[PDB]
Write a protein that binds this DNA or RNA. Structure first.
Lengths: 95, 81, 98, 106, 98, 86, 105, 93
DNA sequence: ATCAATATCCACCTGCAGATTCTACCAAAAGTGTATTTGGAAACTGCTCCATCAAAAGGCATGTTCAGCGGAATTCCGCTGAACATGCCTTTTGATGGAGCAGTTTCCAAATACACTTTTGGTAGAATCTGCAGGTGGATATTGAT
DNA sequence: ATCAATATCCACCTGCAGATTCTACCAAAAGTGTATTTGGAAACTGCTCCATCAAAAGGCATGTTCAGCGGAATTCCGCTGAACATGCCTTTTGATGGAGCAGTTTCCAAATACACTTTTGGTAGAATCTGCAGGTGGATATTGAT
């Protein structure tokens, strides 16, 4: 066996939600996979520094939120913050 | 009476240019410079304040500024860190 | 009735300011500007004095460095007078503009 | 038994992202909400890019998004262009742009 | 005998290449250059084909971006012809020799 | 049984290839000395990235430069590259 | 009991550097030699800068190193200048430099 | 009430290089920032090196490669020698 | 070339803000001794894929010719900045209540560590599906000569 | 402004590489369920040092005058673009030997994890020392007018 993970299937699902009849070449999918990973790393590293500067040993949704605000440009930040807060509020309402 | 950005006077701007090796300055430079300085400060201060709020403080520390400058790629030595 | 020719004193100023390291913008005015801008992000803020100083050292170092690049752009265009279009070229090439 | 992604109302894998955060040496501890928030942001950013790229593909009368479409979507969008200013997209090319002074006549 | 005026075909070329995405440098020659340079740093190295392509995509994006900046420098000096000094000014502002 | 000395390959970056890159960059007119200056600039860029790429290879104890070694080398230099597993 | 710094023949704190590596979230584990190597590199770099800054102070007939001196030392050294190209030295000023074309006819 | 810094070690190193030279407070603060900046850059690069190669440990070898990646030619050369020498002297005892 | 108004520089002087020196205090680390755990080097290995020779052919590089027009030298003048003496409004400097930055005690919601149970994303890979590259030709420009 | 040589535009057509779609084995995840550990939010506190106010300090705003810079015009040499002929070397199709990369089972040197002893680095309230920033003086270079 040989297994390597990627966000490809999740990227594909989201593509179908915004453009039901549009496909994506493997190369473009590879670029989308690199993009998602790049975003993950930037936010995580920023959250990491954030926790370190404040002598906190735990990275919570609050550090992720501040990191998003430092990383994204005006409008994207606002919408990212909403989607983020929304997913956490809902995640917390269950179980 | 006055406006804050206008507090950065023509002579102060001239002095900066001088340290920058500039010999002749056109009149339109002063307003262009103020706008550039305003953008520089907005960007760094926005980040500095964001670190402040995250730490639940009401006081902007030198470190908040140092961290903001570092992530803007303007590392500053001499004020901590 | 003595009088120095245009450029002579500017050249003297360049030598003087390139030797020194003191801040060239006045403190209070800079302080007011910083507080005004910060007020737009969060109200009722306090500043350690060292915070305002780090901010003034970074700002002045930034403008001096920009004036250096601006000077090269004016000279590139066979001028000795810096203009807004010089500052714009330098910022565009630095990637601060685009 | 529900998946954390489902409970969060997300397509992106919360569990995987939680695991990537724990293994990536970012902090001694990672709270349960961190990966939920991060996955939501990642999903939102991917949606925004795919929305724009798909439009670029339609404009070129194509059904399949290719690198060039991703490049046009990103460079024609002010915020994405800034967020991704240090990025190079392979086979993306550049935006058509000819300095005005270069054009002929008057 | 028909002849386009100088600059007409160049403009047609700018529109053509700005519209496409293929690599503009020949593949085999670029690969030899990479192997030659790498060899000088370390002998006996091998290369995945994608490693060579990654280098070519990056090198070409780098050069295209440099020529755009160089073009603005030539234009700034009121020319439409880029010269070595425009490239030098651009690299200097970028900090590649600042 | 071996090699075929690699020499002066920087000339493989031809005048036409350079013109094309300048066209994509929006350049309309090119002076004769641009080609040699461009080769010099490309060489410096390549040496810097390759040096780093090869350094990652050696650290991993491999003899084969991977696409990821190049991607990592580009990232160090601030030139993030998308499309090669990175 | 002898300290690790002395054992490695260094002035910089190997024990402190070690602790900083461990709690800085760099990796699950830190080998014993890593802090030793790192401490020595930091020491050497510090030595290099202090030597040049010291000379810059002597050049100005002063016995106390000040920011200006660190700035002159670094910006006049091709390698240190490159290593610190993104750094601003508070109260360092700039190197004396007037473009030739600006000098009197 | 504490607050750690490299000031005492920097000062000591200062006297080995210039026995008769002093250093102001601000200059000392700059030197401290420099030492911390260096520590962080090297540590972060070694962190990446270990992660890229799926290694859990940061060893002298990661520090070395990071050094070669981060310092310009000659500086790297000497830093590498100084590093190797301290590890050697450390092990030989 | 000759003064003359000014800036620049060097030797000397000394008050003092800031740096080096001394000491008891002691929490916070760093060094140390024991037992437990484990990352990853060493040796053997299955197969991915990289280096390389093979051969055909046309896309593209090379080199030449010719002249359009861009770059750059030159002259010239309108007006924009530099220099400067004058009048004084703002910044700088030093003293004082209180906002709030840190350290502290507390204790619970939340995050490890862990033994199992349940669901999923990856993929080898024979088979079906399909967007669009690319060859073709004709409608509509876009240029440049006249 | 009509003409002619060419490039550009764009919809139609079909072989084919490349993308969407399985049925299934499943290692590796991800989720369920106690048991144990504890990070850091919340309420209270006392000393910093930050904002504010008065008084003394000294840099900036303003109008005049004109030196010389920037840029519009004119001119022409020669560089660089366009076009064409020629044929080479890159590109493409393809199969092969084997170096070397990724995986594997073994297993010891080295690193983690408390627990305990020794000690170094940091600092506050007290003392003292000193490098050098200004301030004076007088010599000399610099600059600009004649």
């Amino acid at each position: 066996r040989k297994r390597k993970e990627s966000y490809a299937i999740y990227i594909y699902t989201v593509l179908k939600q915004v453009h039901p009849d549009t496909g994506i070449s493997s190369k473009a999918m590879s670029i989308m996979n690199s993009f998602v990973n790049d975003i993950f790393e930037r936010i995580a590293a920023e959250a990491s520094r954030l926790a370190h500067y404040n002598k906190r040993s735990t990275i919570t949704s609050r550090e992720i939120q501040t990191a998003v605000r430092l990383l994204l440009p005006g409008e994207l930040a606002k919408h990212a913050v909403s989607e983020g807060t929304k997913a956490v509020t809902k995640y917390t309402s269950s179980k | 009476l006055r406006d804050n950005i206008q507090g950065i006077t023509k002579p102060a701007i001239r002095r900066l240019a001088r340290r920058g090796g500039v010999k002749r300055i056109s009149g339109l430079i002063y307003e262009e410079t103020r706008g550039v300085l305003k953008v520089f400060l907005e960007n760094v201060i926005r980040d500095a304040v964001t670190y402040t709020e995250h730490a639940k403080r009401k006081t902007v520390t030198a470190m908040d500024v140092v961290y903001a400058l570092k992530r803007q790629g303007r590392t500053l030595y001499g004020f901590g860190g | 009735p003595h009088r120095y020719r245009p450029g002579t004193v500017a050249l003297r100023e360049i030598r003087r300011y390139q030797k020194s390291t003191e801040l060239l913008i006045r403190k209070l005015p800079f302080q007011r500007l910083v507080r005004e801008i910060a007020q737009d992000f969060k109200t009722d803020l306090r500043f350690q004095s060292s915070a305002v100083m780090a901010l003034q050292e970074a700002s002045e170092a930034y403008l001096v460095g920009l004036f250096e690049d601006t000077n090269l752009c004016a000279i590139h265009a066979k001028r000795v007078t810096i203009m807004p279009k010089d500052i714009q070229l330098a910022r565009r090439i630095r990637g601060e503009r685009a | 038994a529900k998946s954390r992604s489902n409970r969060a109302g997300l397509q992106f894998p919360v569990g995987r992202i939680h695991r990537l955060l724990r293994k990536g040496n970012y902090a001694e501890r990672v709270g349960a909400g961190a990966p939920v928030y991060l996955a939501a942001v990642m999903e939102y950013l991917a949606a925004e890019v795919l929305e724009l790229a798909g439009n670029a593909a339609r404009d070129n009368k194509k059904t399949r998004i290719i690198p060039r479409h991703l490049q046009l979507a990103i460079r024609n969008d002010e915020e994405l262009n800034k967020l991704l200013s240090g990025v190079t997209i392979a086979q993306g090319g550049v935006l058509p742009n000819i300095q005005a002074v270069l054009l002929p006549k008057k």
